[PDB]
Design a protein around this motif. Structure first.
Motif, short mmCIF file in Angstrom:
data_model
loop_
_atom_site.label_atom_id
_atom_site.label_comp_id
_atom_site.label_asym_id
_atom_site.label_seq_id
_atom_site.Cartn_x
_atom_site.Cartn_y
_atom_site.Cartn_z
N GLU A 1 0.83 -1.20 0.00
CA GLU A 1 0.00 0.00 0.00
C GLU A 1 0.87 1.26 0.00
N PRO A 2 0.36 2.34 -0.59
CA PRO A 2 1.10 3.60 -0.60
C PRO A 2 1.40 4.09 0.82
N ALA A 3 2.43 4.92 0.93
CA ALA A 3 2.85 5.45 2.22
C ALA A 3 2.10 6.74 2.54
N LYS A 4 2.16 7.12 3.81
CA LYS A 4 1.45 8.30 4.30
C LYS A 4 2.39 9.49 4.39
N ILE A 5 1.83 10.69 4.22
CA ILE A 5 2.59 11.93 4.22
C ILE A 5 1.92 12.93 5.14
N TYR A 6 2.72 13.63 5.94
CA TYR A 6 2.20 14.65 6.84
C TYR A 6 3.11 15.87 6.82
N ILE A 7 2.52 17.01 7.17
CA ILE A 7 3.23 18.28 7.26
C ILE A 7 3.28 18.65 8.73
N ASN A 8 4.39 18.35 9.39
CA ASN A 8 4.54 18.70 10.80
C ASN A 8 4.60 20.21 10.94
N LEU A 9 3.64 20.78 11.66
CA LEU A 9 3.47 22.22 11.76
C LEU A 9 3.56 22.66 13.21
N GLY A 10 4.38 23.68 13.47
CA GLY A 10 4.51 24.24 14.81
C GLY A 10 3.59 25.44 14.97
N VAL A 11 2.89 25.47 16.10
CA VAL A 11 1.95 26.54 16.43
C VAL A 11 2.23 27.03 17.84
N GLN A 12 2.43 28.34 17.99
CA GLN A 12 2.65 28.95 19.29
C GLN A 12 1.86 30.25 19.38
N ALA A 13 1.73 30.76 20.61
CA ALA A 13 0.93 31.95 20.85
C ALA A 13 1.65 33.20 20.34
N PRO A 14 0.90 34.23 19.95
CA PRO A 14 1.53 35.48 19.53
C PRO A 14 2.41 36.04 20.63
N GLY A 15 3.63 36.40 20.27
CA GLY A 15 4.57 36.93 21.22
C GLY A 15 5.53 37.90 20.59
N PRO A 16 6.73 38.01 21.16
CA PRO A 16 7.70 38.98 20.64
C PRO A 16 8.26 38.62 19.28
N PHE A 17 8.22 37.34 18.90
CA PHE A 17 8.87 36.88 17.68
C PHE A 17 7.91 36.27 16.67
N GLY A 18 6.64 36.13 17.00
CA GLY A 18 5.68 35.56 16.09
C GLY A 18 4.58 34.87 16.85
N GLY A 19 3.79 34.10 16.11
CA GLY A 19 2.63 33.42 16.64
C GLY A 19 1.35 33.92 16.01
N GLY A 20 0.27 33.19 16.31
CA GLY A 20 -1.03 33.52 15.77
C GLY A 20 -2.20 33.16 16.68
N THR A 21 -3.25 33.97 16.63
CA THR A 21 -4.45 33.72 17.41
C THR A 21 -5.19 32.49 16.87
N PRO A 22 -6.11 31.91 17.65
CA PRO A 22 -6.88 30.77 17.14
C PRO A 22 -7.57 31.03 15.81
N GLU A 23 -7.92 32.29 15.52
CA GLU A 23 -8.46 32.62 14.21
C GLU A 23 -7.38 32.55 13.14
N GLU A 24 -6.20 33.12 13.42
CA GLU A 24 -5.11 33.07 12.46
C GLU A 24 -4.66 31.63 12.21
N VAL A 25 -4.52 30.84 13.28
CA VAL A 25 -4.12 29.45 13.12
C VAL A 25 -5.17 28.67 12.33
N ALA A 26 -6.45 28.99 12.54
CA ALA A 26 -7.50 28.31 11.79
C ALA A 26 -7.43 28.65 10.31
N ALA A 27 -7.19 29.92 9.98
CA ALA A 27 -7.13 30.32 8.58
C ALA A 27 -5.94 29.69 7.87
#
Length: 247
Positions: A1-27
């Protein structure tokens, strides 16, 4: 059977260097699924009377964490929860102080796990702990490892590990594992003994990173990109899977 593929994605809260609100992460999650079709998604998340307003920026509230997971779970994404607070605060210093091994095995770890599945019932796939991390804190015995694995498998969780120190007992316990290889070693013999249990997270450097992995067994591979800025950077290599096929 074919193999599986995933995009490991890091999500953190908005802070001094980046991040996104639950709305931004959802979009963003909707825009990744809009491009990448038959590609899985692995969202990494760090833990944040118990708040509504984040006590200091850089960390999510429990409601915002639930709002993100419930949206990512609805998209079919697997959630990997980071329980780093197992060494957070001997105290009043913000250090990675380590309680006695008994205090952690007897009380806190079951406590944190119970709180975990109480806040995300059956909506978490893997959990990360900084204990199997090449030992570091505590030297775990034979039964001690399999006791922690039992606490995790009790609540139907997988584990994410940075060190392959205890991988040769995790697979024997039959619990799904997430090996983070995005910068040890492992023999392809595991993929023919435990094909549907190992998922390897790799740092995307080129298609040669995937071909080197698919050459072994690796039927489950997660891709973690280097670099909300990354929305477009991932949207560049998101076409690197429509043409990749390789199945």
């Amino acid at each position: 059977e074919p193999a599986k593929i995933y995009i490991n994605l890091g999500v953190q809260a908005p802070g001094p260097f980046g991040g996104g609100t639950p709305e931004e992460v959802a979009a963003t999650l909707d825009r990744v699924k809009a491009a990448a079709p038959g590609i899985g998604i692995i969202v990494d998340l760090d833990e944040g009377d118990h708040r509504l307003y984040p006590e200091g920026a850089g960390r999510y509230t429990l409601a915002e964490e639930q709002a993100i997971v419930d949206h990512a779970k609805a998209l079919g994404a697997e959630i990997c929860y980071h329980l780093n607070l197992t060494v957070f605060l001997w105290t009043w210093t913000g250090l990675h102080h380590c309680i006695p091994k008994e205090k952690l095995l007897e009380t806190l770890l079951p406590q944190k796990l119970d709180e975990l599945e109480a806040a995300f019932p059956g909506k978490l796939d893997y959990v990360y702990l900084d204990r199997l991390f090449d030992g570091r804190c505590y030297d775990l015995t034979d039964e001690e490892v399999r006791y922690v694995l039992d606490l995790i498998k009790e609540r139907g969780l997988g584990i994410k590990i940075e060190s392959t120190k205890y991988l040769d007992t995790i697979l024997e316990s039959g619990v799904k594992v997430l090996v983070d290889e995005a910068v040890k070693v492992l023999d392809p013999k595991l993929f023919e003994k435990y094909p549907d249990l190992i998922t390897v997270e790799v740092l995307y450097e080129s298609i040669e990173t995937i071909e080197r992995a698919l050459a072994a067994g690796v039927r489950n591979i997660a891709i973690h990109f280097g670099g909300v800025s990354q929305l477009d950077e991932i949207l560049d290599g998101v076409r690197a899977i429509t043409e990749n096929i390789l199945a």
